Amino acid sequence: APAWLFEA
Amino acid sequence: APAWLFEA
Amino acid sequence: APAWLFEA
Amino acid sequence: APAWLFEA
Amino acid sequence: MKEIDELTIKEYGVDSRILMERAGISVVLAMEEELGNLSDYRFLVLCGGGNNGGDGFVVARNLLGVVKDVLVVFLGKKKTPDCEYNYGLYKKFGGKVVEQFEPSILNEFDVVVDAIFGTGLRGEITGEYAEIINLVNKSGKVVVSVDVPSGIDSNTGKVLRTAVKADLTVTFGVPKIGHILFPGRDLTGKLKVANIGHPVHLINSINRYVITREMVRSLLPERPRDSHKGTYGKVLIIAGSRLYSGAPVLSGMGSLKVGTGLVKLAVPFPQNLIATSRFPELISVPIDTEKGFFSLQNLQECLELSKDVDVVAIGPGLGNNEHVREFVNEFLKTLEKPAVIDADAINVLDTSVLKERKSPAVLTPHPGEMARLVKKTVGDVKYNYELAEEFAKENDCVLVLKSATTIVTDGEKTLFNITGNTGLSKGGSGDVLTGMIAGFIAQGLSPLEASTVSVYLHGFAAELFEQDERGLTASELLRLIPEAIRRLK
Amino acid sequence: MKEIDELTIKEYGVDSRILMERAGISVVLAMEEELGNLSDYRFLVLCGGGNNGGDGFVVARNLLGVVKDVLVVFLGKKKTPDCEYNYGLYKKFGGKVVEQFEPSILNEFDVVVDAIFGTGLRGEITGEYAEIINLVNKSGKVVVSVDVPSGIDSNTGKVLRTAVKADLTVTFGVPKIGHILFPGRDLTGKLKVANIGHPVHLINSINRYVITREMVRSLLPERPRDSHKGTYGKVLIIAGSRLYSGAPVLSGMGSLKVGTGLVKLAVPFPQNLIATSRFPELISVPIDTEKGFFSLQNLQECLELSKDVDVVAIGPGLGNNEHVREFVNEFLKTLEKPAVIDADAINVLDTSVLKERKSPAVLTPHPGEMARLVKKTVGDVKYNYELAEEFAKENDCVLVLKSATTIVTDGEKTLFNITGNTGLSKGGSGDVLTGMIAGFIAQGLSPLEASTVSVYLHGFAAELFEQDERGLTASELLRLIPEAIRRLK
Amino acid sequence: MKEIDELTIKEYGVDSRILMERAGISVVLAMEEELGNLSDYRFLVLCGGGNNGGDGFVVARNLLGVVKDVLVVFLGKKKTPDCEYNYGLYKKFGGKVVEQFEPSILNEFDVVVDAIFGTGLRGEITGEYAEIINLVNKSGKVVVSVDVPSGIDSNTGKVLRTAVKADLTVTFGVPKIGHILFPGRDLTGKLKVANIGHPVHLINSINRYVITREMVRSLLPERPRDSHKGTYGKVLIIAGSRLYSGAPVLSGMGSLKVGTGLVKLAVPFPQNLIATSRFPELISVPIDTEKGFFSLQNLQECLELSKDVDVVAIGPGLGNNEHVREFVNEFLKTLEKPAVIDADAINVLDTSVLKERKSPAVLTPHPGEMARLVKKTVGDVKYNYELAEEFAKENDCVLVLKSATTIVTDGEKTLFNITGNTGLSKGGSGDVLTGMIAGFIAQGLSPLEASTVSVYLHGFAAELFEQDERGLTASELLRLIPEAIRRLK
Ligand SMILES: Nc1ncnc2c1ncn2[C@@H]1O[C@H](COP(=O)(O)OP(=O)(O)OP(=O)(O)O)[C@@H](O)[C@H]1O
Ligand SMILES: Nc1ncnc2c1ncn2[C@@H]1O[C@H](COP(=O)(O)OP(=O)(O)OP(=O)(O)O)[C@@H](O)[C@H]1O
Ligand SMILES: Nc1ncnc2c1ncn2[C@@H]1O[C@H](COP(=O)(O)OP(=O)(O)OP(=O)(O)O)[C@@H](O)[C@H]1O
Ligand SMILES: [K+]
Ligand SMILES: [K+]
Ligand SMILES: [K+]
Ligand SMILES: [Mg+2]
Ligand SMILES: [Mg+2]
Ligand SMILES: [Mg+2]
C-alpha cells in the first residue's frame, strides 16, 4: 500500500 | 400497492 | 425511520 | 473525485 | 371541485374544519414519504389569508414539537374563518408567527411550505407576494406546495405573473387542470393526490381526467387464440408524395406494431417502393399521379381500396396544394368508413365536410395545424381544452390536440395524456401516432378509446428509450411500442 | 506558461525553489498512483543541466532511503541555479550521481525518470543525448517523463530528431500543446497535470484548451418539457450526387441523433430516395438535375428551401466540377443563414465568398482539403493551429481542422479535441460530424459551441463501439451518438 | 525533532520555506483523503504568529480558487520570518485575513483548520486564544489540526488549560509524544504522519517509538517444523492464594496461547486444582502452605521447580502480607533465571533485590503499583516516561507501565503501545499479559522484545472481540490471542 507521503 | 391516502 | 404518525 | 493535485 | 368541497360540507355534513385538518396532515405525510424522517429539518411555512393558508397553519401546528424548528410567515390581510381557527390553534400550541420577512429569512430554514395561494388565486401576483415567491425560487430550498404552487391558475396552468416552483405539490381530492397543463405541470414538481374524505362518488364524477395505466390496460383489445389477421382489422393509409416519401412507412408500421392485422398504403409511384424495402410486411400500393401528388384523378382508386378496409388514415406527407385539397375533401365526403385525419389532410380540410360525414373521424393536429384550422393564433389554441371540446362537439369528431400534454376529447369527455418526453419533438413522431390510432380503431376500439390508448402508449414507448431522449427517432419509437404494450400488462 | 512561471516568481513572490520542489514531489506522487508502492523499484534518473533536470534532482532526492536504489546520470555541461541547488541537496542527502553511462546501465534499474529536456528543448537532439534516449526507448523499462518527453517540442508536438517514449508524463500547471498534437501526444503516454502552486487566475488565462467532458456537458442545450420540434430547430442539408448517394443520409441522421427537430435533405433525384428508404424520419427532397449534379439551375429551389430553416449544411458528396463550383459559390453568397461547409463545397469554395457573407460559417476540412483550400502542402497545414487561427480570423469563420486531434478555432479561442479512435478513419465519419454541427447550431448553440460539442461527442461515440474499432462504420457511429450524450451527463 | 528541523535547514541546506511549503501541502492532501473533494467546503484557518501559523498560511493559500471560501483569522501579535513570507503570499494570491473574530464566524464555515500553536506552545492558553478554541470545540465543525492540536504539550500530551479537539491531525516527520499519551492522544483524532522531506536517516534516529504491526511481525519467533515442546521453552508461574484462585489460570494460559511449550503453575493447595479443571493442558503443582499464602517455608520447593524452566513469572494473586514479602524477596534474590514480576510481587518488592540480581527482570506495574513502588502519587507517575526510563536504567530491568497507552522501556529504548480498548479495564487482563511476556521470553525473545510483542498482541486481541468491548473478559481475551497472532502475519 503506497506510503511515500503518509504513515497512518 | 397501498393507496388509501395517496394517488401518484 | 419516519415516525410522525406511528410509534411501534 | 478529489483533484487538488492532479487533473487527468 | 369547489362544488365538491361545498357539497361535502353543506349536504354530507362534514365540518369544514375536518376537511382542513385532513388536508394539512396529508401534506405532512407526503413530506415524510418524500424527505424521510422530518425531525432534523427546519420548516418555513408561508401562509396567505385564505383556506390555502389555513391548510398551511394545520401543517405548521402538526410539525410543532416534532421537527427542529417551525416558523409561519403570515402574508395575508385578514383570515377566513377556518384560517383564523387554525392560526388560533397554531398559536395555542406554542407556534411562532411573524407578518414581516427579510430576504435573509430563508437562511435559517431547510424546507419552505408554500400555502400562500391555492385555487383562490385571482389575478396577477404583485407586491410582497411576488417578492417572497421570487426569493423562495432563488433560495435552493426544498419547496412543498399546498394544493397548487402559488401563482399557477388551477383551471389553466398559466403563471399569473410569477409562481412558486415546487419540488413536491400535495393536492386534494383530484389533480387540477393546472398541474396537468404547462407551465403549471412543470412548476408542480412531483404531484401527490391526497384523499381528504370527500365521498368517492363525488370524486369520480369529475369529467376531465388524466389517462392512466389502468385505464389503458382495461381498454386494450383482446387477443383470442383462435384468431386470424381479419380478427385484428385492416387499415388503409393514404399518404406521401414525391416530397415526403417517409411518412407512409412510419404510419403503416405504427398500425402494425399495435397489433393490426393488415396494413395497406396508397402512395404515389415510385415512392411507394420505399415502404416495402424497409418493411416488407407492409402492402404499399403504387398510385400513378401526374406530378407526384394525389389529385382528383386518384379519387376513384382510393375509394375502391377503402371498400375492403375498416379504417382509413389520410394526410401524413400528402403536401398541401390545391389538387391535394380537392382530393382530400371529395374523398372524405364520399368515404363511409372511420377516418383518421392528420397533417396535410388537416391543412386542406374543409370543416363543412366533417359535419356532413355520417361516419366517425379523429383529427390529430399539433397547435400549429389547429390554429390554421380554426383561424386563430397558436397561443390562443395551445392547451385550450374548452376550444378543443367545442370544436369536437360542433364537428362530431374526436380531437387529439398534440403537445407535451396531449388533450383528447369528443366534446363530452376530455382526457389528458402526460406520458412522453422531448424525444417525440422531432419529425416522424406524429406519423407513428396516426397509424397507432387507425390500428386500434381497426381492432374494434371506438375513435375516442383508440385515441386514448394510442397517445398513452406512444409517449410511454418514448420513455422506454434506453439512451438520451434527444436521440430518439421515429424508427426507434416503433421498435419500442411492443415493449410499452408488454409493460402495460 | 513560461510567462506564468515568471509572473508567479517575480510578481507573486513564490521562490523559484518552491516551484521546483512542488514539481518534483508531484512526479513522485504520480508514479506512486501509477506503480503502487515505490519501495521495491530501482530508479535511474536522467538529468539535464536545465530546470527540467533540476526537477529531476528533486525527484531523485525524495526517493532516497525510500526505494531500493536511485542513481542519477547527469548529462549536462553546466547547471542552472535551481538545478545546482537541487543537485547539491541530492548529494548532501547521500545521493549517487555519475556523468558517464554505458549501454548496460539500464540493466540494474526498473524505472527511468526522464528529466533531460523539458520546455527548454531547442533544436535537434544529437550526440550522447540522442544515444541515451535511443537506449532508454529499446530498454523496455517503465519510463516517466518530467514535464514533456525529452525531444518533443512542447509548442508543436514534433519530434526534434529523437524523443523519449514515456509510459507516464507529469506536466506542471497546464497541458502543453506538444502533449496534445501528434506525434507528441503518442510519446506522452498517460498524462497527469499537476498543480505546483501557480495562482489559479493565471492557469485559467491560457487561451488554448482541451475540450473536456465538463465543458461539453455545460454546453449541451436544454430540453424543456413543454417543447415541440420547432423548439429544436430545422436543418437543410444540400448534398449528394449520382456518384455519392450515401453522404446525405449520414449527414441528415447526424443532425437527428443530436436532437434536432426537423431535417430536410436536398439531393439529386432519384438518389434522394435512398435516404428515406434507410431512415423514413428524414425528409429527402428530390432535386431535378441535368446530369446528376447540382448546378446553377438548382440555385433558386435551394434558396427557397433555405428560407424555412435555421442552418444549412452543404458539400458532402456534391462532386467537384465547374457547375457545382458555380452553384456552391452563388448559393453561399446569397444565403443569409448560418452555413456548415464541408467536403466538396470546400474543394470548390471561393474564399472571397466567406469574407462577404454577413451570416456565420463553420468549415470542416481534413488536412487534404485545408491544404488545397490555402494552396499549401498537407505537411504544412497538418496540426498547424496558428495557420488555422489566421484563416478563421481572416475569413470570419469557425474552422474545424479534422485529424486524430481536431483543432476548433474562431481566430481568438482555440480548442483541441482528443476523443475518438481509428474507427473514424473511414469514409462516412466526416459526413456524420457535419450533420452534428448543423444540428447543434439549429438548437441554438453558436457555431464555435456547436463545433466544440460535436467534435467531442463524435469521437466519444466512436470509443463506445463494443467491438474492435477498426470495424466501426458510420451507421454504427450514428447509433452510438445518443449513448455518448447520455454518458456525458 | 526541533533538532531535526534545524539540522535539515542548517546542515543539509533545505530552505526553511521549502519545509513549510511541504508541511502545508501535506495538510491539504490529508484533508482531501479524509473529506473527499474539497471544492464544496468553506474553510476557516486559524493562524498564530509562529511557524505553525505559517504552515496554516500555506494551507490557506493552496485552497484559494479551489474551494468555495477561505478565510484566515490571524490571532498572533508578530510573525516569524516564514509566517510573514507565507502571509505575504496568501495576500498576494488574493486571500482574506482578519485579525478579529466574533463567535458567529463559525457559522459560515464547514472546516476549521487549527494552525494556532504547534510544538512552540509554552504555558497555559488564556485570553482570545482560549476563547476561540472553546468556540471551535462547541461548533460541531470538522476540525483539522496542523502538527498538534493547539493546547496540547507535544512532549507530554497534557492539556495546557484548554485545547482543540481535532477530527484529523496532520503531523510532520514523526508522531510526537503528545499524540501518543492521553489526553493528547484523544484530542488528536485520526493522526496522519507526513513526510516533508527530512533525510530519512534523521527520522530514523528518534529513540522513542510507537510499536507497530511490522515491528511485532519481525519479532515473532520462528516455528521450525522439526521442533518439540522443549523448542518453545518452559515457564513457571508462582501465583495465587486462598483469596485469589483465578489469577494463576489466566497467567498460565496466557503463556500457552502465545506458543510456549510447557507451563507449570505453583499455587497453594487446593486452589491449584482450579487451574486444571478449567484447562487440563496446564500443570498446576500443589504447594502446601500454612494459611493459604506462600511463605518462606515454600522457598526451597519453588527454587527446585525453577531449575527445570527458562523463565519464572511471580505475583498475580499472591496477596500482600509480610510472609509473602519475605518469600518474594528471598526467592528473587536466589533465582538465577529471568523473572517477570507483577501485581502483589511488585507491591512487596524490595528494589535493592533487583539491583543485586545477575539475571534479567521485567516489571509490569499499573500506575497504582508504580506509584507505591517509587513512593510517589499516581498523578506523578502516570504517563511519566522519563521516570519509567530512570527506574529501568537504575534497576537494570525492563519496565512495562500499563495504561491505555502502555510504556515499555529498558532505560535506553522506549516504546509506546496504542493497541487495546476499555474491555481490558477489568480484573484479569493484567494476569494474561504477565503470562504472555513470560511465554515469549521462554521462546527466546529478550525481555524488552517479549514485552514489546506481548503488549501489542494483548491489546490487538481485545480489539478483535466481536461484541461490545465492555463485555470482554480475560477468558475471552485468551481465546482471541491466536487470532491476533494470525492477523499479524
Ligand atoms: N416534449 C414532448 N413531450 C411529450 N410529447 C411530445 C413532445 N413533443 C412532441 N410530442 C408528441 O409527438 C408527436 C408530434 O406530432 P406532430 O404531428 O406534432 O410532429 P411531427 O414532426 O409532424 O411528426 P410527423 O413528422 O410524424 O408529422 C405528438 O404526439 C406530440 O404530442
Ligand atoms: N485516427 C483518428 N482518431 C480520431 N479521430 C479521427 C481519426 N481518423 C479520423 N478521425 C475523424 O473522423 C472524421 C473524418 O472526416 P473526414 O472528412 O476526414 O473523412 P471522410 O472519409 O471524408 O468521412 P466522409 O466520407 O463522411 O466525408 C473527422 O472528424 C476526423 O477528426
Ligand atoms: N482503556 C484501556 N485501553 C487499553 N489498554 C488497557 C485499558 N485499560 C486497561 N488496559 C490494559 O489492561 C491491562 C490491565 O492490567 P492491570 O494489572 O492494570 O489490571 P488488573 O485488573 O490487575 O488485571 P489482573 O486482574 O489480571 O491483575 C494492562 O495491559 C493495561 O495496559
Ligand atoms: K399554494
Ligand atoms: K523530460
Ligand atoms: K495547531
Ligand atoms: Mg404531424
Ligand atoms: Mg469529409
Ligand atoms: Mg495487575
**For residues F198 and F376, what is the distance between their CA atoms, to the nearest angstrom?**
40
The answer to whether E471 contacts F284, with C-beta atoms less than 8 Å apart, is no
The answer to whether F92 contacts G13, with C-beta atoms less than 8 Å apart, is yes
- Ligand 2 nearest atom to the CA of residue F434, by list position: 26
> What cell was used for F200?
489559479
Chain F interface, Cβ < 8 Å to A: 28-29, 32-33, 36-39, 62, 66
The CA-based angle G236-G242-G245, given to 5 degrees, is: 55
CB contact burial F281-311 (16+ within 10 A = b; e otherwise): bbbbbbbebeebbbbeebbeebbebbeebbb
> What cell was used for E167?
419540488
DSSP per-residue letters across E44-74 = EEEE-SSHHHHHHHHHHHHHTTTSSEEEEEE
User: What angle, 0 to 180 degrees and rounded to 10, lies between the N-to-C axes of helices F81-92 and F16-35?
Assistant: 60
With H, G, I as helix, E, B as strand and everything else as coil, classify residue E374. Answer: helix
Identify the nearest ligand to the CA of F451 by its number: 2
With H, G, I as helix, E, B as strand and everything else as coil, classify residue G138. Answer: coil
Identify whether the C-beta of residue G165 lies closer than 8 Å to the C-beta of residue G140. Answer: no
Query: Which chain D residues touch F191 with a CB distance below 8 Å?
Result: 8
Identify whether the C-beta of residue E478 lies closer than 8 Å to the C-beta of residue E253. Answer: yes
Query: Which chain G residues touch F62 with a CB distance below 8 Å?
Result: 197
Beta bridge partners of F262: F234
Provide the experimental method for this PDB entry. Answer: X-ray
Give G32 to chain D, closest Cα distance, Å. Answer: 6
Q: How many whole angstroms from E196 Cα to the centroid of ligand 4?
A: 17
| Total Cβ atoms within 10 A of residue G131 | 15
Side chain identity, residue G110: D
Contacts of F158 (CB under 8 A, 6+ apart): F152, F178, F183, F184
> What cell was used for E261?
392485422
- Say if ligand 1 is within 6 A of residue E258 CB: no
The answer to whether D7 contacts F33, with C-beta atoms less than 8 Å apart, is no
CA distances in angstroms from G259 to E166, F400, G223, G439, listed in the order given:
69, 75, 9, 7
Identify whether the C-beta of residue E8 lies closer than 8 Å to the C-beta of residue E14. Answer: yes
Identify whether the C-beta of residue F184 lies closer than 8 Å to the C-beta of residue F159. Answer: yes
Identify whether the C-beta of residue F423 lies closer than 8 Å to the C-beta of residue F461. Answer: no
Chains D and A touch (3+ CB pairs under 8 A): no
**For residues E192 and E176, what is the distance between their CA atoms, to the nearest angstrom?**
11
Chains C and E touch (3+ CB pairs under 8 A): yes
Q: Which helix (H) or strand (E) holds D6?
A: strand D6-7
Q: Which helix (H) or strand (E) holds G50?
A: none
**For residues F287 and F293, what is the distance between their CA atoms, to the nearest angstrom?**
9
The CA-based angle F309-F315-F318, given to 5 degrees, is: 120
Query: Residues of E forming the annotated binding site for (6S)-NADPHX?
Result: 129, 147, 317, 431
**Pocket lined around ligand 2, Cβ cut-off 6 Å:** F 316, 343, 366, 402-404, 406, 420-422, 424-425, 427-431, 433, 458-459
- Ligand 1 nearest atom to the CA of residue E402, by list position: 31
> What cell was used for E44?
418555513
Q: How many whole angstroms from F52 Cα to the centroid of ligand 3?
A: 57
| Sign for the pseudo-dihedral over CA of F297, F301, F303, F305 | negative
**For residues G32 and D2, what is the distance between their CA atoms, to the nearest angstrom?**
6
Distance of CA E19 to the CA centre of its chain: 29
> What cell was used for F17?
525553489
| Total Cβ atoms within 10 A of residue F13 | 12
Chains that touch C (3 or more CB pairs under 8 A): E
Side chain identity, residue F354: L
Chains that touch A (3 or more CB pairs under 8 A): F, G
Strands F398-401 vs E142-146: parallel, antiparallel or unpaired: unpaired
Q: Which helix (H) or strand (E) holds E442?
A: helix E429-442
**For residues E386 and E396, what is the distance between their CA atoms, to the nearest angstrom?**
15
Distance of CA F205 to the CA centre of its chain: 19
Residue with cell 523463565: G311
CB contact burial G165-175 (16+ within 10 A = b; e otherwise): bbbbbbbbbbb
Give start and end residues of each alpha helix (H) in G110-236: 127-137, 177-180, 184-188, 200-203, 213-219
Residue with cell 389529385: E295
Chain F interface, Cβ < 8 Å to D: 26, 29-30, 33, 191-195
Q: How many whole angstroms from E290 Cα to the centroid of ligand 7?
A: 25
Longest dimension (CA), chain F: 85
- Structural Rg of chain C based on CA atoms: 5
**For residues F68 and F427, what is the distance between their CA atoms, to the nearest angstrom?**
53
**For residues F136 and F44, what is the distance between their CA atoms, to the nearest angstrom?**
10
Which candidate, G188, G156, G150, G193, places its Cα nearest to that of G173?
G193
SS (H, E, C) chain F: CHHHHHHHHHCCCCCHHHHHHHHHHHHHHHHHHHHCCCCCCEEEEEECCCHHHHHHHHHHHHHCCCCCEEEEEECCCCCCHHHHHHHHHHHHCCCCEECCCCHHHHHHCCEEEEECCCCCCCCCCCHHHHHHHHHHHCCCCEEEEECCCCCECCCCCCECCCCCCCCEEEEECCCCHHHHCCCHHHHHCEEEEECCCCCHHHHCCCCEEECCHHHHHHHCCCCCCCCCHHHHCEEEEECCCCCCCCHHHHHHHHHHHCCCCEEEEEEECCCCHHHHHHCCCCEEEEECCCCCCCCHHHHHHHHHHHCCCCEEEECCCCCCCHHHHHHHHHHHHHCCCCEEECCHHHHCCCHHHHHHCCCCEEECCCHHHHHHHHCCCHHHHCCCHHHHHHHHHHHCCEEEECCCCEEEECCCCEEEECCCCHHHCCCCHHHHHHHHHHHHHHCCCCHHHHHHHHHHHHHHHHHCCCCCHHHCCHHHHHHHHHHHHHHHC
Side chain identity, residue F52: N
User: HSE of G58 in the Cβ direction (CA atoms, 13 Å)?
Assistant: 27
| Sign for the pseudo-dihedral over CA of F3, F8, F11, F13 | negative
Q: How many whole angstroms from E418 Cα to the centroid of ligand 1?
A: 13
The CA-based angle E365-E370-E374, given to 5 degrees, is: 145
Domains and CATH numbers, chain G: 1-206 (3.40.50.10260), 207-489 (3.40.1190.20)
Contacts of E89 (CB under 8 A, 6+ apart): E57, E58, E61
**For residues E115 and E121, what is the distance between their CA atoms, to the nearest angstrom?**
12
- Size (chain G), residues: 489
Q: How many whole angstroms from E317 Cα to the centroid of ligand 7?
A: 9
Which candidate, E388, E121, F231, places its Cα nearest to that of E380?
E388
> What stretches of E282-342 adopt beta strand conformation (E)?
283-287, 311-314, 339-341
Query: Which chain E residues touch C2 with a CB distance below 8 Å?
Result: 32-33, 36-38
| Total Cβ atoms within 10 A of residue G84 | 14
Residue F412 has phi, psi (to 5 degrees) of: -110, -50
Residue located nearest, by CA, to atom 14 of ligand 1: E430
Which candidate, F426, F454, F420, F452, places its Cα nearest to that of F182?
F420
**For residues F261 and F233, what is the distance between their CA atoms, to the nearest angstrom?**
5
Identify whether the C-beta of residue G148 lies closer than 8 Å to the C-beta of residue G174. Answer: no
| Top mutation candidate among E429, E455, E478 for ligand 1, by most atoms within 8 Å of CB | E429
Beta bridge partners of E341: E314, E363
CA distances in angstroms from E415 to E336, E406, F306, G9, listed in the order given:
27, 8, 39, 82
Distance of CA E432 to the CA centre of its chain: 18
Identify whether the C-beta of residue F308 lies closer than 8 Å to the C-beta of residue E277. Answer: no
Distance of CA G279 to the CA centre of its chain: 32
Longest dimension (CA), chain A: 12
With H, G, I as helix, E, B as strand and everything else as coil, classify residue G378. Answer: helix
| Top mutation candidate among F346, F429, F431, F476 for ligand 2, by most atoms within 8 Å of CB | F429
- Size (chain A), residues: 8
> What cell was used for F129?
543525448
Distance of CA E283 to the CA centre of its chain: 34
Resolution in angstrom units: 2.1
The answer to whether G193 contacts A6, with C-beta atoms less than 8 Å apart, is yes
| Total Cβ atoms within 10 A of residue F363 | 27
Give D6 to chain F, closest Cα distance, Å. Answer: 5
F122 CB-contact burial (10 Å; exposed 0-12 / middle 13-18 / buried 19+): exposed
| Top mutation candidate among G245, G250, G425 for ligand 3, by most atoms within 8 Å of CB | G425
Q: How many whole angstroms from E215 Cα to the centroid of ligand 4?
A: 30
**For residues E478 and E480, what is the distance between their CA atoms, to the nearest angstrom?**
5
User: What angle, 0 to 180 degrees and rounded to 10, lies between the N-to-C axes of helices G322-334 and G299-306?
Assistant: 40
Identify whether the C-beta of residue F308 lies closer than 8 Å to the C-beta of residue F234. Answer: yes
Identify whether the C-beta of residue F398 lies closer than 8 Å to the C-beta of residue F448. Answer: yes
**For residues E276 and E270, what is the distance between their CA atoms, to the nearest angstrom?**
11
Query: Would residue E124 be called left, alpha or beta, if left means φ above 0 and alpha means ψ between -120 and 50 degrees?
Result: beta
Residue F388 has phi, psi (to 5 degrees) of: -60, -45
Which candidate, E128, E54, E43, places its Cα nearest to that of E88?
E54
**For residues E243 and E320, what is the distance between their CA atoms, to the nearest angstrom?**
11
Beta bridge partners of F209: F415
Side chain identity, residue E364: T
Chains that touch B (3 or more CB pairs under 8 A): E
**Pocket lined around ligand 3, Cβ cut-off 6 Å:** G 316, 343, 366, 402-404, 406, 420-422, 424-425, 427-431, 433, 458-459
Side chain identity, residue G25: I
Identify the nearest ligand to the CA of F462 by its number: 2
User: HSE of E138 in the Cβ direction (CA atoms, 13 Å)?
Assistant: 11
Residue E405 has phi, psi (to 5 degrees) of: -110, 120
Peptide bond into F183 cis (omega under 30): yes
Identify whether the C-beta of residue F421 lies closer than 8 Å to the C-beta of residue F211. Answer: no
SS3 content of chain A, % helix, strand, coil (to 5): 0, 25, 75
**For residues E111 and E44, what is the distance between their CA atoms, to the nearest angstrom?**
6
Among chain F residues, the shortest Cα distance to A6 is held by: F29
G413 CB-contact burial (10 Å; exposed 0-12 / middle 13-18 / buried 19+): middle
**For residues F264 and F156, what is the distance between their CA atoms, to the nearest angstrom?**
41
Which candidate, E369, E454, E470, E471, places its Cα nearest to that of E419?
E454
F299-306 contact pairs (CB < 8 A, 24+) = F299/F327, F299/F330, F299/F331, F299/F334, F301/F266, F302/F236, F302/F238, F302/F266, F302/F327, F302/F331, F303/F331, F303/F334, F303/F335, F305/F236, F305/F264, F305/F266, F306/F236, F306/F335, F306/F337
- The DSSP secondary-structure symbol of E108 reads G
**For residues E426 and E458, what is the distance between their CA atoms, to the nearest angstrom?**
13
CA distances in angstroms from E120 to E2, E45, E72, E150, F151, listed in the order given:
10, 18, 20, 10, 76
Identify whether the C-beta of residue G346 lies closer than 8 Å to the C-beta of residue G270. Answer: no
Which candidate, G312, G304, G317, G268, places its Cα nearest to that of G289?
G268
**For residues E54 and E85, what is the distance between their CA atoms, to the nearest angstrom?**
8
> What cell was used for G104?
458567529
Identify whether the C-beta of residue F226 lies closer than 8 Å to the C-beta of residue E183. Answer: yes
Residue with cell 494556532: G116
- Size (chain C), residues: 8
For testing the chain G interface, which of F25, F37, F82 should be mutated: the one with the most G CBs within 10 Å? F25
Give F91 to chain G, closest Cα distance, Å. Answer: 9
With H, G, I as helix, E, B as strand and everything else as coil, classify residue E428. Answer: coil
- The DSSP secondary-structure symbol of G343 reads T
**For residues E188 and G278, what is the distance between their CA atoms, to the nearest angstrom?**
73
Identify whether the C-beta of residue E47 lies closer than 8 Å to the C-beta of residue E241. Answer: no
F213-218 contact pairs (CB < 8 A, 24+) = F213/F456, F213/F488, F215/F452, F216/F452, F216/F453, F216/F456, F216/F457, F216/F488, F217/F488, F217/F489
Among chain D residues, the shortest Cα distance to F213 is held by: D8
**For residues E202 and E7, what is the distance between their CA atoms, to the nearest angstrom?**
9
